[PDB]
Amino acid sequence: GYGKGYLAMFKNKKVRFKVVNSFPDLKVQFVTSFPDYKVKISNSSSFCEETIKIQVVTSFPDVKLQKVTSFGDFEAYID
C-alpha cells in the first residue's frame, strides 16, 4: 500500500481514515510517544481531502501516529 511519506502530503489538511480489517492503504499504530506524525482527530467529516483505508495494528505498522489535541501535522476524521 502507501508508505510512511504519503501522509506528508497532507500537512495542515484533513483526511478521512476508514477503518478496515483487510487490504488497508496504511497499517497504523497509535502511540503516545515518538510517532512518525502527530494527528488531530476531528469530529466533523467535512473538508476531508481524501479517504485513506487504515488497519489499526499493535506491531509492525507502516506509520506511527500520535493523537494530539493541538499542533498536528494533519487532521483526520475516523469512520
What topology does this entry show?
Elements: E1 14-19, E2 26-31, E3 37-42, E4 51-56, E5 63-68, E6 74-78
PDB class: structural protein
Keywords: knotted protein, structural protein
Assembly: monomeric
Describe the structure.
The protein has no helices and six strands. The protein starts with 13 loop residues before the first strand and ends with a strand. It has one domain (6-78). The chain is an all-beta fold. 0% of the residues lie in helices and 44% in strands. A six-stranded parallel barrel has the order 1-4-2-5-3-6. To Synechocystis PCC 6803 slr1025.
Short description:
To Synechocystis PCC 6803 slr1025. The protein is mainly beta and 79 residues long.
How many whole angstroms does the radius of gyration measure?
11 Å
Count of helical stretches: 0
Strand ordering within the main sheet: 1-4-2-5-3-6
Largest sheet: 6 strands, parallel, barrel
Characterize the overall form: globular
Provide keyphrases for this structure:
monomeric; knotted protein; 44% strand; mainly beta; structural protein; 79 residues; 6 strands; Uncharacterized protein UU089.1
